[PDB]
Amino acid sequence: TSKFPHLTFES
Amino acid sequence: MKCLVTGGNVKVLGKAVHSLSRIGDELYLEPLEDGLSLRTVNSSRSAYACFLFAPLFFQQYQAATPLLRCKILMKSFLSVFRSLAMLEKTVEKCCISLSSRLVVQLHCKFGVRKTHNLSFQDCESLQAVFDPASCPHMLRAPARVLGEAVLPFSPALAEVTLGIGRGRRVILRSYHEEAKAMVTEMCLGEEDFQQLQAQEGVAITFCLKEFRGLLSFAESANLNLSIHFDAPGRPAIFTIKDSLLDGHFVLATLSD
Amino acid sequence: HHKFRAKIVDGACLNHFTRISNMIAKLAKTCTLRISPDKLNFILCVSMWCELEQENFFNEFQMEGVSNEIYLELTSENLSRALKTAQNARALKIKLTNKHFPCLTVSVELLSMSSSSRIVTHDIPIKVIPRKLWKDLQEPVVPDPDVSIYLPVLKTMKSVVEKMKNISNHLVIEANLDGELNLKIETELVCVTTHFKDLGNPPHMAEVHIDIRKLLQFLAGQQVNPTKALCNIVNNKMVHFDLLHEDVSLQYFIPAL
Amino acid sequence: DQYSLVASLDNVRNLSTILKAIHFREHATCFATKNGIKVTVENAKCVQANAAIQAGIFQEFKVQEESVTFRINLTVLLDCLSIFGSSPGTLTALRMCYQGYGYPLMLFLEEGGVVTVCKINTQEPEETLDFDFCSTNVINKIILQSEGLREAFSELDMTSEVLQITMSPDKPYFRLSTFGNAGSSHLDYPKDSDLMEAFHCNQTQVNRYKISLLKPSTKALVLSCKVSIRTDNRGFLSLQYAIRNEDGQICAVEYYCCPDE
């Protein structure tokens, strides 16, 4: 369930 | 920076703060030229949300100190705005200003003034790399339509699968990993959809609890919600657009 | 080789059926459902027995068991949640299925705001029960009690029991054949006795020490003041509440301590 | 032989509501004289809440000697008084009998024929300490409408340790302040506010009070129309409340709080 790929943020 | 909200936009600002609180524990403040930005982020960095308040949303808007990037515990910013009942009835004008503290003044009735001096940490521009134009699939419907769709799901359900079935049906299946859980599936037709450009068989899965946070805000304001998404793994983009208001939620999706 | 197909179209009947499951969910977390051709039952064995008249609720109904009853236990929260969706629905269809695992599937035609039909489908997981266990799952007989007395206004009972719970977990309930019923708690610091009067009996004072939590669990989760509220007491062994309202029987049994 | 104290009410809530405004400890001290009962609840030798209900409220009130005093469990007492709950609208009568020292406090309640009998064991009173609060050396005093102050007290920044009260003939006239984590919160009341009923501030005074001690005064605040706030030359805070019951009669509730150094 909680195995979401990271969102790519700028920093 | 000097923001000033009056009238009914006071509660609207509170609903946005409430909406961001169901996503992250810290509130990022970023005054821009095209309006005030309130942003937040998951603890897993798998969810990003951002409200943009165009300058005409306010009575008065000065962006830069003649640039500000902020970071505040949203527990604090919530307590400042919690319960819109007292925000509608009492609060006339709401002032946000900036030194050492971020100040918030609530000008209530009968001359009564409430003043908060919140401490803050300077930070980066919390921005997520996303682009709706890059997404091949799109949904669009009034928020209330999507709000009735997530109605038969348990409010404790974390995850829901959004898919496109045969016959241009929009299907919402509850998601679980393998002790037997109740499985709920919702099926919409393409008719009560304003726009539907998504290939049959395509399906993604995202956090339902966070998607609700945007729904609760847009339902009341009677706005139009559009979902843009790609293949599993790639983020899903949930957009909200008013003349006064901009707002998008970017959620991560499951892989494979 | 079990087969069950039922459908509800009437809103007033749907409201009634939904109120029932909500009560069961407040009486149990896991309960057993009996599917008979004439009736419908909910069992938990503190025992709770609940009977329904099928033709009063459903427009369509089909029941088939190989050698005329069908038993299966649910989590009552799952059934209640599924029904709550049909708060204003147009059609409520219930059928047994066996897809990934044997389920009790509830299909709902939600109110078409317009245009197309909104269709919800809940796959409620079940557990089939073999006939070897059916005998141990029957309605608990009421072995002729010492005293039988008509219960007072349940709201008033519930209100009194609520405050007593905050003091002790031991409740002494004694009924009398002239119309007397007493609720009674004792403690080192405080004693409380509530006196009920002129309740009437169907055609000495028998008492029973019960867990007050179990009584309050019964009074709360009770939809309306029933048209038939009856309390049977076997001296210091058992208390039994016979209830009927609107063509729905409800038996509840609390043992002594 | 005869009881040492008896009290009757056609409506028990004309006693229960007032006790709720005092209920922030487990035990209470009762003082029955010719002029009603004075229930007092005290904590930490710093807080004290008094409830003085006059004998005029009761349909029956008899005392033998001049002084009658027992310590009672306020929590249990308030459970028994509300044992018939709050129906929408037939009343619930109360017969309250106290035989004397060593004997329990007996309660009798009736509603629609149903009778509840309570036996509550008493206790020898601990010394209830005296705060010498005289209007003689009171510095500042304002009278406010409770309706708008409930927000100030229930939206309380409990992360803070004290509550700073400032009363002054100058700005900001009336200000409540908390200082918690990452947040400094204030609340200004102009003297020309319509919420103000009386503003008699002679001298600027700033006093701090333990937030844990003033919070339970909300229970009295939300039952009153107006609230009186006085500070003296000791820094002691007084809170006089005006609770109107269901028979159009008014009883007094008073809080005292030691300042915090």
Numbering used by the authors:
A (entry chain D): 88 to 98
B (entry chain A): 1 to 66, 70 to 101, 105 to 184, 190 to 267
C (entry chain B): 0 to 44, 52 to 73, 77 to 212, 226 to 279
D (entry chain C): 13 to 100, 103 to 275
What's written in the study?
Eukaryotes have two types of DNA clamps: the replication clamp PCNA and the checkpoint clamp RAD9-RAD1-HUS1 (9-1-1). 9-1-1 activates the ATR-CHK1 pathway in DNA damage checkpoint, regulating cell cycle progression. Structure of 9-1-1 consists of two moieties: a hetero-trimeric ring formed by PCNA-like domains of three subunits and an intrinsically disordered C-terminal region of the RAD9 subunit, called RAD9 C-tail. In contrast, RHINO, a 9-1-1 binding protein, interacts with both RAD1 and RAD9 subunits, positively regulating checkpoint activation by 9-1-1.
Assuming that hydrophobic or aromatic residues of RHINO are involved in interactions with RAD9, a conserved region of RHINO (88-TSKFPHLTFESP-99) was considered a candidate peptide binding to the hydrophobic pocket of RAD9. Crystallization trials of the 9-1-1 ring in the presence of the RHINO peptide were performed, and crystals suitable for X-ray diffraction study were successfully obtained. Ultimately, the crystal structure of the 9-1-1 ring in complex with the RHINO peptide was determined at 2.81 Å resolution. In contrast to the RAD1-binding region of RHINO, which binds to the edge-to-back side of the RAD1 subunit, the RHINO peptide (residues 88–99) binds to the hydrophobic pocket on the front side of RAD9, across the IDC-loop of RAD9. The hydrophobic pocket consists of two binding sites, subsite-1 and subsite-2. RHINO bound to RAD9 adopts an extended conformation, distinct from the PIP-box that forms a helical conformation upon binding to PCNA. The side-chain of Phe91 of RHINO is accommodated into the subsite-1, and the side-chains of Leu94 and Phe96 of RHINO are accommodated into the subsite-2. These side-chains interact with residues in these subsites through vdW contacts. Hydrogen bonding interactions through main-chains are also observed in the crystal structure, where the main-chains of Leu94, Thr95, and Glu97 of RHINO form hydrogen bonds with the main-chains of Arg45, Val135, and Gln133 of RAD9, respectively. Phe91, Leu94, and Phe96 of RHINO correspond to Phe361, Leu364, and Phe366 of RAD9, respectively, suggesting that interactions of RAD9 C-tail with RAD9 could be similar to those observed in the present structure. The biochemical and structural analysis revealed the mechanisms underlying intra- and inter-molecular interactions on RAD9, suggesting that the representative sequence for binding to RAD9 would be FxxLxF.
